[PDB]
């Protein structure tokens, strides 16, 4: 036997003991329960710092609250996670949107059934109900135009939301490498103005296919309410991924900007959208 698609749905989030308890339901392509998953995990628990809160003009960004591999198989298709060490930095804030990134590793069930990789994110408010605000800009579908589905893109994972959940601005800044925040990295790896990674790769191949065409990734969707952030939210952290010759701090290539407080006053969405579009 072999499962074609593994679907993961979060069916309940409850905060008791403070820490969240999260129930996941696993189904196959025929919507039948999948029991016995041995490699299910909450790869990341996050919360969403809203636009502005880290400073003026700044992007919303994801703050880390931990992860969990500790769960009970409820033997009907559902699995319930607990956290042994939730929010170790003690920043949990029930006012913020909360996200869980759930993944199941490819493998096999007790009876030898093969099961593929699965990944998802879902967002909630601070008590497990619907989220009041989101940062939904891009979804995986666009990457599947040019990257084989179900296979890792570069490393770690197969879907863009998983990448975004680990490659946070906090993660990048904590390691001393702002360029590894996903909103920087993704433009960098497809744009030839600057090399990337351990082999100092110049992305000529990506450049010639993507051609800085924002609309191959940034598309309108009812499911993605922040899709217009690509033109609405100019920051030095992101815009510099391709505009690599500006030094905002020293005023080289541009007037000095010591933060993102005023970018949008000049770089209005209409202008940014129009000038970057063929
Ligand atoms: C075609 C229009 C593309 C879309 C949409 C996306 N990517 Fe892409 N990517 C593309 C090419 C032609 C290449 C270069 C491959 C090469 O071997 O040189 C890439 C590269 C990446 C990489 C770097 C991998 C590498 O150079 O080793 C990553 C990490 C990457 N792409 C991720 C990615 C994601 C997450 C996308 C959706 C948001 C996405 N790409 C779209 C072509 C295209
Ligand atoms: C944490 C759980 C990760 C997930 C999920 C993904 N990545 Fe990752 N990535 C991670 C680390 C710790 C590092 C090293 C960063 C450093 O200190 O150097 C990386 C690195 C990359 C890179 C290289 C970036 C650069 O050097 O400029 C790329 C291109 C990259 N990661 C891409 C990527 C993609 C597309 C992901 C989803 C498919 C992905 N990463 C997930 C940690 C994690
Ligand atoms: C896929 C290869 C992409 C192309 C081409 C472009 N963008 Fe992009 N961008 C993409 C991703 C995966 C993300 C991260 C989304 C997340 O949730 O973190 C982004 C992000 C931006 C942002 C940041 C918005 C914010 O709220 O801070 C901006 C301003 C942005 N992208 C602009 C941009 C422009 C102008 C492009 C064409 C010149 C462009 N993007 C291409 C993926 C890709
Ligand atoms: C790579 C995917 C890019 C990202 C991310 C951003 N921009 Fe960009 N920009 C890009 C290209 C290829 C070009 C040249 C287009 C052309 O027709 O020559 C541009 C150009 C600009 C300009 C005009 C500059 C000029 O030389 O007259 C501006 C003002 C500009 N871009 C702004 C901008 C901002 C504010 C961004 C973050 C939201 C941003 N760019 C991202 C490629 C890329
Ligand atoms: C009005 C006082 C501005 C403020 C505040 C910011 N920018 Fe700007 N920027 C402005 C102009 C008039 C231009 C030149 C446009 C042209 O046609 O050449 C720019 C240029 C940029 C570019 C393009 C740089 C390049 O490679 O040519 C980018 C990416 C850019 N600006 C981004 C940006 C950001 C992120 C800001 C806040 C930190 C910002 N600018 C402030 C006008 C003004
Ligand atoms: Mg680059």
Task: Give me the secondary-structure topology.
Blueprint: E1 7-15, E2 20-27, E3 40-49, E4 61-68, E5 71-73, E6 78-81, E7 98-104, E8 107-108, E9 114-115, E10 118-124, H1 140-143, H2 160-166, H3 169-174, H4 182-188, H5 204-210, H6 229-232, H7 236-239, H8 263-266, H9 269-276
Antiparallel strand pairs: 1-2, 2-6, 3-4, 3-7, 5-6, 7-10, 8-9
The protein binds heme C (5 copies) and magnesium ion (MG).
**Distinct helical segment count:** 9
- The chain-level structural class is alpha+beta
Question: What small-molecule ligands were found?
Answer: heme C, magnesium ion
User: How many separate domains?
Assistant: 2
Along the chain, the helix and strand elements come as EEEEEEEEEEHHHHHHHHH
Q: What does the main sheet amount to?
A: 4 strands, antiparallel
Strand order of the largest sheet: 1-2-6-5
Separation of the first and last Cα atoms: 49 Å
PDB class: electron transport
Keywords: Multiheme cytochrome, Shewanella oneidensis, Extracellular electron transfer, Redox.
Assembly: monomeric
Entry title: Crystal structure of domains I and II from the outer membrane cytochrome MtrC
């Amino acid at each position: 036997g072999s499962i074609q698609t593994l679907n993961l749905d979060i069916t309940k989030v409850s905060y008791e003991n403070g820490a969240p308890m999260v129930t996941v339901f696993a189904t196959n392509e025929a919507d039948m329960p999948v029991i016995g998953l041995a490699n299910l995990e909450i790869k990341k628990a996050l919360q969403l710092i809203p636009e502005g809160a880290t400073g003026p003009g700044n992007s919303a960004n994801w703050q880390g609250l931990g992860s969990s591999k500790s769960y009970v198989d409820n033997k009907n298709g559902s699995y319930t996670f607990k956290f042994d060490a939730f929010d170790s930095n003690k920043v949990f804030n029930a006012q913020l949107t909360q996200r869980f990134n759930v993944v199941s590793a490819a493998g096999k069930l007790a009876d030898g059934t093969t099961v593929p990789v699965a990944e998802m994110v879902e967002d909630f408010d601070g008590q497990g109900n619907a989220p009041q605000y989101t940062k939904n800009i891009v979804s995986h579908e666009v990457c599947a135009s040019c990257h084989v589905e179900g296979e890792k893109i570069y490393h770690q994972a197969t879907e863009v939301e998983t990448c975004i959940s680990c490659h946070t601005q906090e993660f990048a800044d904590g390691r001393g490498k702002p360029h590894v925040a996903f909103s920087h990295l993704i433009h960098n790896v497809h744009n030839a103005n600057k090399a990337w990674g351990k082999d100092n790769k110049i992305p000529t191949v990506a450049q010639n296919i993507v051609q800085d065409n924002c609309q191959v990734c940034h598309v309108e969707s009812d499911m993605l309410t922040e899709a217009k952030n690509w033109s609405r939210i100019p920051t030095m952290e992101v815009c510099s991924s391709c505009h690599v010759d500006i030094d905002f701090a020293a005023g080289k290539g541009h007037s000095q900007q010591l933060d993102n407080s005023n970018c949008i006053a000049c770089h209005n969405s209409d202008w940014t959208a129009e000038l970057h579009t063929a």
